[PDB]
């Protein structure tokens, strides 16, 4: 009952295997580690689906109604320089 999620971070995909009872934040941590995206910590990133909706990171993966071949975009909440 594992679910395959392609997570895209700065344009780079990583496939993360997920179980239905895992919150989405579990996949966030894994995708950032897999893609070496470290300059801001995991809580500073958020998920959007292909339709562009912001996803609740605390919701269980099985509750979204993903199809087996889902792509999600994981992007920063904010970028600042000065």
């Amino acid at each position: 009952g594992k679910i395959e999620i392609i997570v895209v971070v700065n344009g780079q995909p990583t496939q993360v295997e997920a179980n239905p009872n895992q919150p989405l934040h579990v996949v966030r941590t894994k995708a950032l580690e897999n893609t070496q995206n470290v300059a801001q910590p995991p809580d500073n990133w958020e998920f959007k689906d292909e339709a562009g909706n912001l996803l609740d990171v605390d919701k269980k993966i099985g509750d979204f109604g993903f199809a087996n071949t889902v792509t999600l975009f994981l992007s920063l909440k904010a970028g600042v320089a000065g």
């Binding site: 700065n10 344009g11 995909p13 801001q40 920063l76 904010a78 970028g79 320089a81 000065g82």
Partner: protein, 162 residues
């Protein structure tokens, strides 16, 4: 495969320097910092910069100065765009009102988030022509620290072509 961390040489088109300079100079005329991004294709230990992106951005006055902020909607747009185009984000570039360095804010909120990415800081609102020996450059390590790349190492790394 070869991580971005292991890039040793970078091809930087002069046109991509010009696009950065024009943006930084333009907003600098209003006393504001600007931000630009270099994207391209990684060829293992070489990186070819293909384009400059000027992200949608806002300019806000802080207690000790000015900052440039990129909103969430634009960071999402950039992610999707890089994915569709098969491009990689190598570098961010921003300007300072005076001397160039990486501030504590710069250290904490970078857009170029991958181990091995570069963050270049252009002094004096980019008033003078861009010069790799005069910028302050930093590279992100595996423990999320932005460490200075000395000028001599930066010029060995990056070659500007025409």
């Amino acid at each position: 495969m070869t991580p971005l961390e292991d890039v040793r040489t970078v091809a930087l088109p002069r046109d991509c320097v010009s696009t950065v300079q024009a943006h930084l100079r333009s907003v600098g005329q209003q006393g504001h910092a600007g931000m630009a991004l270099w994207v391209g294709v990684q060829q293992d230990q070489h990186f070819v910069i293909a384009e400059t992106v000027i992200p949608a951005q806002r300019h806000i006055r802080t207690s000790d100065g000015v900052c440039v902020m990129v909103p969430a909607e634009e960071l999402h747009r950039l992610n999707v765009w890089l994915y569709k185009r098969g491009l990689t984000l190598l570098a961010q570039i921003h300007s300072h009102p005076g001397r160039a360095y990486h501030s504590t804010t710069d250290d904490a909120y970078a857009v170029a988030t991958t181990i091995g990415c570069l963050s270049l800081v252009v002094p004096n609102f980019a008033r003078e022509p861009f010069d790799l020996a005069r910028v302050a450059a930093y590279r992100l390590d595996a423990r999320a620290n932005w460490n200075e790349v000395p000028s001599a190492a930066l010029t060995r790394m990056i070659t500007i072509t025409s």
